[PDB]
């Protein structure tokens, strides 16, 4: 679920910038859902 | 290491289809975006496009999109049709970072083919 | 797409100088600019990847710098290998486009 929305995100036609911002705030609902 | 290799005819005829193919040693095909770069004289180093190396997903430079197609045959290949001498130019592939997760490699290349010289003429 | 420029285009240094070469993107790239080494009739060799991320076995004399819209590749020390075209490309955004070059060539 993280790795298939994470490498998704990464083939996007946006900038890396937005791929990061967006790439951290998906694995920060992994992070809270698993502490 | 990793090493690729460019394949095919060096000269194509205006209005026919650019084919090129590019190989993949070392054995880590899957795991990156791979890439067609060419230059030319005129206007420099262009960036032609990215393939995701595992499922085949593309993102064209918008001045190609409408006539460009990268995909999987560790072997991948570029077709570019419609051409004009202005495609006329020295074709590399490359190898850009990984698909697994964003890295700040995204975007850049870090191997390159030996590139192949692409005579557009009649 | 995101326009970049390289200054100066021309350049003329001796082993053991020291030499810097600009590259201009006209809008931010959020500091997402990599360099490279060209030599006549090669395939370019990656220099650097993120203003100053060395690319592995590229010599400490190299380094990059800069941020917001200037950028600077900058040679400590000048070698003879070093002589060749250097471009800069922005990898932030698509499509991904580069600077025309800057040729470093040898005065006498």
């Known amino acids: 679920r993280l790795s298939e929305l994470l490498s998704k995100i990464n083939d996007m036609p946006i900038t890396n910038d937005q791929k990061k911002l967006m790439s951290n705030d998906v694995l920060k609902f992994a992070a809270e859902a698993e502490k | 290491q990793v090493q690729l290799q460019e394949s095919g005819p060096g000269l194509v005829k205006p209005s026919e289809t650019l084919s090129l193919t590019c190989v993949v040693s070392g054995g880590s095909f899957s795991s990156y975006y791979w890439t067609w770069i060419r230059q030319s004289p005129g206007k420099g180093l262009e960036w032609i496009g990215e393939m995701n190396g595992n499922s085949g997903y593309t993102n064209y430079n918008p001045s190609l999109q409408s006539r460009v197609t990268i995909s999987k045959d560790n072997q991948f290949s570029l077709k570019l049709t419609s051409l004009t001498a202005a495609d006329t130019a020295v074709y590399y592939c490359?190898?850009?970072?990984?698909?697994?997760?964003?890295?700040?490699?995204?975007?850049?290349?870090?191997?390159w083919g030996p590139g192949i010289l692409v005579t557009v003429s009649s | 797409d995101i326009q970049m420029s390289q200054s100066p285009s021309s350049l003329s240094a001796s082993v053991g100088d020291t030499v810097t070469i600009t590259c201009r993107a006209s809008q931010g790239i959020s500091n997402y600019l990599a360099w490279y080494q060209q030599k006549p009739g090669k395939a370019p060799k990656s220099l650097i990847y993120?203003?100053?991320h060395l690319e592995s076995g590229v010599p400490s004399r190299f380094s990059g710098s800069g941020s917001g819209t200037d950028f600077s590749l900058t040679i400590s020390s000048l070698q003879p290998e070093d002589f060749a075209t250097y471009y800069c490309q922005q990898h932030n955004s698509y499509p991904r486009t580069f600077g025309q070059g800057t040729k470093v060539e040898i005065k006498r």
């Open positions: 993120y203003t100053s």
């Open positions: 490359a190898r850009d970072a990984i698909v697994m997760v964003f890295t700040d490699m995204r975007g850049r290349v870090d191997v």
